[PDB]
Subunit: 163 residues, 6 copies
């Protein structure tokens, strides 16, 4: 079965809470990364319609500092698939509420996997229908490959560290 | 002019039902959140200044953590620039009933000291032990490797901000 | 000095957390009511681009029990505007992450007030564009009026209660 | 058997926590409504034993602002009873801890339904004792009708959005 | 500059939340302690009308396990003073909402110190009214004495541990 | 069978979050007690290899205020035992991140009890290895005895109350 990339899209608009602020009253990278895993998993659920799990998150670069005045929106769709794997694109936009002026804060490639009876299950492939969607699709296979290599470099480090 | 031990930080914790998902397994988000949290302490101890998370290298979720396990986060500064700091964070899981332990993940995560408004000078780290040396070899390599990631991520910002047609 | 309703839309898609669950493993009304106030204030900030404050919430009727299996999406726009008030229409949909059977769990009128230098500050008027949006505006004044009445029944009660 | 209203009374007094303050440093409405559902559910629980569910909540008017320097008290008890329904009354007092000046911040009627086997269940009737327990028990049956009419619009609006039934 | 105990009484009834449950589906001891501190902190404020801090907690003995379906009532009041210190009694009662049968889960003497402008500040004296209130007042002096001592052992242990 | 103390060692270093502060920008005592219970519950499990429950906490003397700038290290390990019970020692040390001027904020003896199928359950013996470890181990007996008294005092106060 097949599924449009818009059929698994999830948005989360929210205020910045002051507990989640730091030494200079800026949002902790961690809370951003927490919001990205949660919105990203919803997309992954909508698309595969089965119980998923976070396997990897690609590198994330924090472009701009977020404040107590700012709002923060997390847009998330599925833009690639293997058999059980989903690559979810997530864009993080920070709107200053009073000033009104938006700015891009982080973008993230994050990788969800469907699981059934403890074993990974099949997921429908996603098909793009937008310039941005198309470019993501085209470029996606390259990343999925750079990731298989990355996964092995992580597993090696788990074993070196052991001994 | 400072040692990696001088910024070491350990947080050992319990897993809380609210961070379990539908399969009763810890969320990735919870883990990334604590990797940022401890890392931020490490970078603080070291720099002796207030820092901010510049970037977090990719992280691979090697194992599922359960309700009956405990998670240990170990982290220290292992590389330095002039305001930057490569923090290395190691995530050990351990069944509390059984003695079985496993590495759940590793993460390089980059903090930037800020004195007033903009980045400030942060001391250079000298490895002491064997494993502290082995993590200094790749320091210069990943630093560049990342320097290329930021610009890529910064260009994609502009494609979305300025609306540049995708191929640039 | 004017603004379309859609300029104040704000959505929050989220999962149900087991701590916000009760003895039947059902979502508490309060987490729903808390979420509604949260999403609605962003809507109220986007619109007035000023510091708003929650003055009242109309009755909510909880139509359907939300489960650990479901997501809950919260849509929120300003439908009516006073001198410094603003009615925010808030729709609460709840779909089963797997099955995919969507349903509306609650709907809520909720009244925010712009505030500056500690005293109520002016807001734009708001203009509908859709069938549903037009019915909101049109029926809006009837509601604004019942609130000026209910607020007196409320103030009077506080006074009796001191006794 | 029928209970006597003060057999299901519940008080929660509490601090105000910086995370639940506004842009203005005043308490959010949502926190208050969440606390009101919380206490009410205990009252509703004590009265009828069993296990209840929030059917609906009458409008709430936020009479006062609440500040980081204050304390808030939630007092709640069943006042009306239908067959399975329970009307909980909730009084919300704010107090400056350093002043000792107390105000009413809000009141709320909030209906609760007992559920024994995934379907509704037989709640005991509530007898009032004091004058206050008289003064708001009498107008009980009035505001219970209003809510049959409130539910109708809401249930009606559901189908308009669900079934897309054209507005009117 | 004298106040009755009822003028500091504070009550907190809560349900037991699944986060704060341990692996045996029973409440964490540290949740019970966190709550005991927060309710005792209100009482000390109610009574001092000044901003207070926690100086000590006496030993607490957890007499009953608290399960998922129980309520928990915290009842705190000031029960003995000195110059800048206030000593709050906290009785914690756990009620099974279905069975309706209560039990005492713990009681706690917790000490707060009123503090104005970086240094401890003056506090009203307390006046008992009931038998219970009178009982806890007379016995205050003796409790105050042991605190003064254990404090020394605690500051001793802090010098020697480093 | 029996384990060394360092086989139950648990460490928790942590930020001081602004929600856990009071009006004076200082850490709530009850948060410290919450953190202390949680890190000691790991030490207990690590050593017991069974489901543990807090049975009591000794008095705790808060020697230092902890400001929002500070970090908090909690260090727990088991240091006396009986049949099903385990007494855990916890030292709390407060470091000013931007000056690193460490001080001990508190120290705590907290007693946990291993539990198997409703009832208390067998737990290994603890072996000291250092001065401190040897130190706390010898004094363990006296402390176990004084605890035994209070529990009766604590049960006494529970019968006598409502
Ligand atoms: C994800 C996981 C279930 C994979 O199961 P496995 O049997 O070990 O791995 P497999 O080789 O069968 O992987 C199956 C799929 O996962 C994908 N995958 C697994 N690990 C991945 C990683 N680190 N990065 C990207 N894709 C990954 C594979 O590419 C493959 O995709 P496919 O459907 O196209 O074949 C396993 O890695 C796991 O459970 N990890 C932790 C899960 C978790 O709990 N998340 C974080 C906990 S905090
Ligand atoms: C990242 C940031 C520091 C860039 O600062 P800047 O003044 O614009 O740029 P500079 O390149 O001069 O930054 C100085 C250092 O940051 C490093 N840096 C900045 N972004 C980086 C990234 N993504 N990865 C690695 N290093 C990075 C630079 O390499 C440089 O290291 P060096 O000083 O040793 O040479 C600033 O944009 C920032 O930190 N904002 C976001 C921080 C934040 O709030 N993060 C979490 C929010 S959720
Ligand atoms: C709303 C508030 C800020 C201003 O009240 P006030 O000083 O009496 O102001 P007014 O009586 O002149 O009313 C000003 C506006 O508030 C609106 N308003 C006030 N209370 C209202 C209520 N209960 N329902 C609906 N509208 C209300 C009025 O309609 C008016 O809007 P408009 O003039 O643009 O038409 C005040 O009622 C308040 O502070 N209450 C809530 C405080 C808060 O923090 N909310 C919840 C905390 S938990
Ligand atoms: C409450 C609920 C069980 C009603 O069940 P139902 O079979 O649909 O309806 P019934 O007519 O049998 O309702 C039974 C009682 O609920 C009362 N009731 C139901 N909805 C009500 C509402 N919105 N306001 C007031 N009373 C209401 C009825 O008056 C009736 O009282 P009675 O027993 O004395 O006659 C159902 O509406 C429900 O479960 N919804 C809320 C559940 C929930 O989880 N809420 C909060 C989640 S965020
Ligand atoms: C408690 C504190 C104010 C002690 O003040 P100090 O100037 O060092 O000592 P003092 O003897 O002057 O204390 C003043 C009063 O408090 C009492 N007191 C102080 N420390 C005490 C302790 N540990 N136990 C009991 N009483 C204590 C003194 O007996 C005295 O009582 P009195 O004046 O009514 O007779 C100070 O040590 C402090 O701030 N402690 C930590 C506060 C805190 O942050 N608590 C929670 C941290 S997690
Ligand atoms: C632990 C508990 C079952 C006591 O056990 P019991 O069935 O009464 O039998 P005992 O009192 O003999 O307990 C057995 C052991 O625990 C020790 N113990 C029990 N209660 C104790 C207390 N209050 N203080 C210290 N030690 C205690 C006994 O000394 C004995 O040690 P030992 O086994 O080496 O001889 C009971 O105190 C309890 O479960 N309390 C609630 C625990 C809890 O939920 N904690 C958090 C509450 S929020």
């Amino acid at each position: 079965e097949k599924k449009f990339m818009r059929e698994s899209k999830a948005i989360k608009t929210t205020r910045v809470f002051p507990n989640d602020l730091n030494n200079h009253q800026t949002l902790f990278g961690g809370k951003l990364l927490a919001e990205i895993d949660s919105i990203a998993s919803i997309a992954a659920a909508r698309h595969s319609r089965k119980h998923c799990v976070t396997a990897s998150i690609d590198s994330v670069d924090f472009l701009t500092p977020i404040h107590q005045a700012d709002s923060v929106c997390y847009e998330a769709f599925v833009c690639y698939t293997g058999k059980s794997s989903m690559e979810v694109f997530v864009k993080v936009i920070a709107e200053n509420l009073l000033a009104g002026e938006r700015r891009i804060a982080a973008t993230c490639f994050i990788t969800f996997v469907a699981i059934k009876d403890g074993k990974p299950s099949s997921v429908p492939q996603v098909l793009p229908e937008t310039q941005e969607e198309h470019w993501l699709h085209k470029t996606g296979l390259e990343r999925a490959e750079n990731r298989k290599k990355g996964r092995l470099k992580s597993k090696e480090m788990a074993e070196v560290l052991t001994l």
